[PDB]
């Protein structure tokens, strides 16, 4: 009896059930509570040496590995979930996408327009909800659905 894309999982380190979304890679302790033509999202992108365009306003030659990019992504997720940092502030400071200028805002879009893994996570999110790591050809994303 779980919303779309959510499933119950067992955590081995703590021995407790949690909830996992296999579309967004979101996870949380708490049980989670047509689809629209368009959603609005912000994101924080961390590129790596195998991104389709491995450079950004933050560095001319992006050399980090995929797993280094994932480590940075998880660090940002930790700070956001714990309240140590705001999503928008981290996107402005550290996103490798030029949308960092607008605090990660990408505006509105509909299915078919974005990269498929990005689109699926975005439409699987509920408004105000945040994804886990989402992998695309651009790099690794954190996605926040704002409308």
UniProtKB/Swiss-Prot annotation:
Start and end residues of each WW domain: 1-33
Any one Gene Ontology molecular-function term assigned to this protein's record: peptidyl-prolyl cis-trans isomerase activity
Compartment(s) of residence: Nucleus; Nucleus speckle; Cytoplasm
Assigned GO CC terms: ciliary basal body; cytoplasm; cytosol; glutamatergic synapse; midbody; nuclear speck; nucleoplasm; nucleus
Tissue localization of expression: Expressed in immune cells in the lung (at protein level). The phosphorylated form at Ser-55 is expressed in normal breast tissue cells but not in breast cancer cells.
Annotated EC: 5.2.1.8
UniProt cross-references to Gene3D superfamilies, sorted A to Z: 2.20.70.10, 3.10.50.40
Residue positions, PTM Phosphoserine: 55, 92
Xref: CDD domains: WW
Matches recorded under Pfam families: Rotamase, WW
Post-translational modification: Phosphorylation at Ser-55 by DAPK1 results in inhibition of its catalytic activity, nuclear localization, and its ability to induce centrosome amplification, chromosome instability and cell transformation. Ser-55 is dephosphorylated upon IL33-stimulation of dendritic cells.
Keywords in alphabetical order: Acetylation, Cell cycle, Cytoplasm, Isomerase, Nucleus, Phosphoprotein, Rotamase
Catalyzed reactions: [protein]-peptidylproline (omega=180) = [protein]-peptidylproline (omega=0)
Entries under PROSITE patterns matching the protein: PPIC_PPIASE_1, PPIC_PPIASE_2, WW_DOMAIN_1, WW_DOMAIN_2
InterPro entries referenced in this protein's UniProt entry, alphabetically: PPIase_dom_sf (IPR046357), PPIase_Pin1 (IPR051370), PPIase_PpiC (IPR000297), PPIase_PpiC_CS (IPR023058), WW_dom (IPR001202), WW_dom_sf (IPR036020)
Domain PpiC: 36-147
GO biological process, one term: negative regulation of SMAD protein signal transduction
Mutagenesis or variant effect for residue 18 to A: Reduced affinity for KIF20B
Function: Peptidyl-prolyl cis/trans isomerase (PPIase) that binds to and isomerizes specific phosphorylated Ser/Thr-Pro (pSer/Thr-Pro) motifs. By inducing conformational changes in a subset of phosphorylated proteins, acts as a molecular switch in multiple cellular processes. Displays a preference for acidic residues located N-terminally to the proline bond to be isomerized. Regulates mitosis presumably by interacting with NIMA and attenuating its mitosis-promoting activity. Down-regulates kinase activity of BTK.
Description of its domains: The WW domain is required for the interaction with STIL and KIF20B.
Protein name, entry field: Peptidyl-prolyl cis-trans isomerase NIMA-interacting 1
Phylogenetic placement of the source organism: Eukaryota, Metazoa, Chordata, Craniata, Vertebrata
Designated gene of the protein: PIN1
């Amino acid at each position: 009896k779980l919303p779309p894309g959510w499933e119950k999982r067992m955590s081995r380190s703590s021995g407790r059930v949690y909830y996992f979304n296999h579309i967004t890679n979101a996870s949380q302790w708490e049980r989670p509570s047509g689809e629209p033509a368009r959603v609005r999202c912000s994101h924080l992108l961390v590129k790596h040496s195998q991104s389709r365009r491995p450079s950004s306003w933050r560095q001319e030659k992006i050399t980090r590995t995929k797993e280094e990019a994932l480590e940075l992504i998880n660090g940002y997720i930790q700070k956001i979930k714990s309240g140590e940092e705001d999503f928008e502030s981290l996107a402005s400071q550290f996103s490798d996408c030029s949308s960092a200028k607008a605090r990660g805002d990408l505006g509105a879009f509909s299915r078919g327009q974005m990269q498929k893994p990005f689109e699926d996570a975005s439409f699987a999110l509920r408004t105000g909800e945040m994804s886990g790591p989402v992998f695309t050809d651009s790099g690794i994303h954190i996605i926040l659905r704002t409308e």
